[PDB]
């Protein structure tokens, strides 16, 4: 009697060492007398359907030599899990296993004052990116600087097309605590870290200043005239976070039509933002008052600020 | 005389080391009483072993066979961090080889490595480079830190207030 000889071969890295998108794992079972031979594979112990692998048992007289190829993609090897081709032969068990021979970024949302002042529904999302996955715990901690017992949040995942997984979470907030500026601390954990990451912010600091909001009109061009564009300015306030909006005839105006600028600070230490919005023909034939409204904290009385500007 | 394998002394958590004092007790008539923190040991041989170290087993260590001449208090450095310079010997006599190396967490891939004479960026190289100073001299003491490329993020390892004994 001779026991079989099991070895494992794979695909190849080229003369620069690059990457085939599918890898071919050839499990060989050579040097054995035939008899009772059934073959399986164990991907992390788990089995899949019988149509991912191929074999050709070569029988040389009293000896035999089984080869057995399995083809997967590259990304399963890039998933870095362990595969175990296994054969049953006369009870005596011989096997071999093979696997392959990171970062963690997170963010945090700051919502719109519309959701605070007008929609009035504060639900804060804590944002984690670059979830290169593991098999262990991802134990998260939404937590509070005041430490009162919390309510419950969201939990979702997505495997991105550049490969990675993700988790974020969204917890509801009260309003008045943020009006008073309560601070909170979403907090994930992981065992593989030498150290972990905390993150926190709240309502901003400093004194308060109201802005100088205005908006004006454009003339026409000799080329075409039925498609004009208006724009909105603001300047010299503190702090900076403002829902800006768009009003005409009790309709929330569509978002992707208007373009806004970025908050830059003025040279006189205030801040200033501008915007833009195209107009077309038939709506001025309808009506003329289109309100670029905004929401600054120091706006009066209900954080209400606009100039109703029109044409002619 | 403690013969430390490996002669590096500052470690992360859960790591292994060879602990061996005097070679003059090579034939070992009396066994070795090791002193974690003063507390008497239980090791039969004259070599102690650590596998998967604990933070709370650290600190002052001595041993002795049975002679009045007890070993020296050796102090141990278990860590859990991101950036670590890594040394063999601090109280170094004159004319001695000096050993200098930096270490990353779970022994990973760090690049763009500057060694620092006490603030002054003394030697950069693109990767790790085990520095040797084969003979000690006068102006060599100081407090020396490290910098590199970690997951594209960038931090700075600790500076170490090196003292030279001058004879």
């Amino acid at each position, epitope marked *: 009697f001779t026991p079989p000889t099991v070895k494992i071969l794979q695909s190849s890295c080229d003369g620069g060492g690059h990457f085939p998108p599918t890898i071919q794992l050839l499990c060989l079972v050579s040097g054995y007398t035939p008899g009772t031979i059934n073959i399986t594979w164990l991907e992390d112990g788990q089995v899949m359907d019988v149509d991912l692998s191929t074999a050709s048992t070569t029988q040389e007289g009293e000896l035999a030599s089984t080869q057995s190829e399995l083809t997967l993609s590259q990304k399963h090897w890039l998933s870095d899990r362990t595969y175990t081709c296994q054969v049953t032969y006369q009870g005596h068990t011989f096997e071999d296993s093979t696997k392959k021979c990171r970062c963690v970024s997170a963010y945090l949302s700051r919502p719109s004052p519309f959701d605070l002042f007008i929609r009035k529904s504060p639900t804060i999302t804590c944002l984690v990116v670059d979830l290169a996955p593991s098999k262990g715990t991802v134990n998260l901690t939404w937590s*509070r600087a*005041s430490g009162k017992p919390v309510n419950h949040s969201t939990r979702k995942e997505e495997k991105q097309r550049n490969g990675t997984l993700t988790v974020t979470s969204t917890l509801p907030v009260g309003t008045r605590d943020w009006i008073e500026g309560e601070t909170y601390q979403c907090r994930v954990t992981h065992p593989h*870290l030498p150290r972990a990451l905390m993150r926190s912010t709240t309502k901003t600091s400093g004194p308060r200043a109201a802005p100088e909001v205005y908006a004006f009109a454009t003339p026409e061009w000799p080329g075409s005239r039925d498609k004009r564009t208006l724009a909105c300015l603001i300047q010299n306030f503190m702090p900076e976070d403002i829902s800006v909006q768009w009003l005409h005839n009790e309709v929330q105006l569509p978002d992707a039509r208007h373009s806004t600028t970025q908050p830059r600070k003025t040279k006189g230490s205030g801040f200033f933002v501008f915007s833009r919005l195209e107009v077309t023909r038939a709506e001025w034939e309808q009506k003329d008052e289109f309100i670029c409204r905004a929401v600054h904290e120091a706006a009066s009385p209900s954080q209400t600020v606009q100039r109703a500007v029109s044409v002619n | 005389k403690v013969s430390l394998n490996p002669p590096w002394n500052r470690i992360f958590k859960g790591e292994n080391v060879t602990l061996t004092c005097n070679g003059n007790n090579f034939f070992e008539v009396s066994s070795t009483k090791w002193f974690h923190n003063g507390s008497l040991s239980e090791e039969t041989n004259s070599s102690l072993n650590i596998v998967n170290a604990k933070f709370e087993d650290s600190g002052e260590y001595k041993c002795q066979h049975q002679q009045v001449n007890e070993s020296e208090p050796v102090y141990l450095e278990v860590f859990s961090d991101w950036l670590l310079l890594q040394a063999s010997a601090e109280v170094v006599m004159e004319g001695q080889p000096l050993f200098l190396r930096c270490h990353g967490w779970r022994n990973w891939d760090v690049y763009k490595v500057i060694y620092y004479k006490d603030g002054e960026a003394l030697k950069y190289w693109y990767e790790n480079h085990n520095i040797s100073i084969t003979n000690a001299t006068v102006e060599d003491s100081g407090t020396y830190y490290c910098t590199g490329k970690v997951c594209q993020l960038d931090y700075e390892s600790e500076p170490l207030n090196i003292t030279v004994i001058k004879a």
Partner: antibody, heavy 120, light 112 residues
């Protein structure tokens, strides 16, 4: 925001009794962030004394508790401390502070000005 | 005295401007739980109010420069400043916040 007014430095005989006060300027204290008393012996060490939070949960120092107590008035926004049976070594500088929570551990944004007690 | 006692090192230092200066306080037992060290950093101003320097042994409160750096491990923990400034003369402290009652170091004043 919040501002602090300590009150009550003076000279009282040992083993006597006195009361304290700690005035808050800018927050109804009943709703969060523990309300605390602090000792420091000048020229010497430091002392967290005790800690009471907004729901009324108290904590004291075990070497000291058994002779001193603490009272509260959040409507007057002012909380106090009656002291009893003091020795010579209680001559120190005494502070008042405001707890801030983090993971079962607490901290102060707020430091008092410190008042002087001098007992023989 | 059944709890952890805190010993700072050195006690006081005479210095000059722009210097890269360091201190170290020491504890007895290690309480570094869950990868967290429950230590904080403090400064009294002599004749005036105290001040938190660093909470959670690594994180600065809002309103400081960046010239300052705390570190250490186990019971050995260590604060460093890279550059001295004229505003830097005060008295300075570290403190633990894990197991109550919460203990303190002896204090450190800087000279020139």
């Amino acid at each position: 925001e919040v501002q602090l007014v300590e009150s009550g430095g003076g000279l009282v005989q040992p083993d006597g009794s006195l009361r304290l006060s700690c005035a808050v300027s800018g927050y109804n204290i009943t709703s969060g962030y523990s309300w605390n008393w602090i000792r420091q012996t000048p020229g010497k060490g430091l002392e967290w004394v005790a800690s009471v939070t907004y729901d009324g949960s108290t904590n004291y120092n075990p070497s000291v508790k058994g002779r001193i107590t603490i009272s509260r008035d959040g409507s007057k926004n002012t909380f106090y401390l009656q002291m009893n049976s003091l020795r010579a070594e209680d001559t120190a500088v005494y502070y008042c502070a405001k707890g801030n929570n983090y993971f079962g551990h607490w901290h102060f944004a707020v430091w008092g000005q410190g008042t002087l007690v001098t007992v023989s | 005295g059944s709890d952890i006692q805190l010993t700072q090192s050195p006690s006081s230092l005479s210095a000059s401007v722009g210097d890269r200066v360091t201190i170290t306080c020491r504890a007895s037992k290690s309480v570094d739980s869950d990868g967290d060290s429950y230590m904080n950093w403090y400064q009294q101003k002599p004749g005036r109010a105290p001040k938190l320097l660093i909470y959670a042994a690594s994180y600065l409160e809002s309103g400081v420069p960046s010239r300052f750096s705390g570190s250490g491990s186990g019971t050995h923990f260590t604060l460093t400043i890279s550059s001295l400034q004229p505003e830097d003369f005060a008295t300075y402290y570290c403190q633990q916040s894990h197991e109550d009652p919460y203990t303190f170091g002896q204090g450190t004043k800087v000279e020139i």
